[model samples]
Target: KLPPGWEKAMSRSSGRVYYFNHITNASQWERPSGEPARVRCSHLLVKHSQSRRPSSWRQEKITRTKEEALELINGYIQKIKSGEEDFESLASQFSDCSSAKARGDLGAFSRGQMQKPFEDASFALRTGEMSGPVFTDSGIHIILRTE
Candidate 1:
C-alpha cells in the first residue's frame, strides 16, 4: 500500500507510476522505498570540454576544463551553503542547462525522465536535502531535492 500523503496513478508525463502528495498538491512518478517513484528537484550544472555535449544555450562554445567547471559549481554551492545566496540566483546566472532559465527547476520526474547518473544521484537525496557534486554525461551537477 502507499504511504501517507502519497497515492499512485497513471501519468505518462510523470510516466509509468504516478504518485502524489495531497499535503503539497505535488505529483510525480515515484518509489519512496529505494526512492520515491518521482522526485521534485532543482539543479545547477556546468559543462566542460569533455562533457557529452559541451556547449549550452548560455555558452555557445563551452571551453572550460572539468576541473574549472567544478570550481565554479563549487563556488556556487558554497554560496548557497553559506545561506548568503540561493540556488535560484546562482543557477539562473551560471548553470549551463536551459533549465537555468527557470532557476534550474526540473520539477517532478521519475527515473527515465532524466539521465541515469543524474537520476541516481537525485534519488540519493531526501526531501530538503541537497547533493555535493555529481557527474553525468551532460556535465557536473548539483541537486536539491524539494520533495
Candidate 2:
C-alpha cells in the first residue's frame, strides 16, 4: 500500500497537480526473481511549496521486470515526447498503483516531501506536460502535470 501518510495527503490536496500510480502491497513487482524492486513517490520542491501532497508514487506491479519494464516504460516516454498517449489514460491503464483508479491523478503537494526524482520531474513539466515510464524501484510510470 502507499506509505502510511502518503495517500491521505494525495487525496486531500489541491496544489500543484501530481500523478499517483499504485496503492496496495498485496504483492510486489520485481525486476527479477531475487532483486528487490524500488518504488518512489515524488513531489515538487521549489523555493517554496505552496501545497502539501504526493506528486506520484510508482507501484509494486510495475516493478515486475527491470529490463522488460524499462523497455515498455521507454516506449511510453517516447509517447510523451511524441505527444501520442495522453498521460492520464496511460497512467490509469498501465500503472499498478492504487491512484490509477483515479486515472493517474495525484491530489497535490508542497515541495520537500516528495522523492527527488519525482519532484524534479513534476516541476519540469509545463502544465499539460507528460513523461513516462520513468523507472524506479516502485516500477514504471508516466507523469502528467496540471499545474
* Reference-based lDDT, each prediction: 0.79, 0.45
Give the TM-score of each candidate: 0.74, 0.50
Which runs in model 2 stand beyond 4 Å of their true positions? 1-63, 79-84
Error of 1 at 70 (Å): 1.0
Task: State the lDDT at 106 in candidate 2.
Answer: 70
lDDT for 53 in candidate 2 is 22
Clashes of 2: 15
Worst 10 residues of 1 by lDDT: 21-30
Model 1 CA lDDT for position 137: 86
TM-score of 1: 0.74
- The regions of model 1 sitting more than 4 angstroms off are 1-34
**Candidate 2 weakest ten by summed lDDT:** 42-51
Query: Which digits, one per residue and each the tens of the lDDT, describe model 2 over residues 1-147?
Result: 442212222224444433343221111122112111222332111111111322234432222335565566666566745678765666666665667667666766656655555655555444554544443334445566665
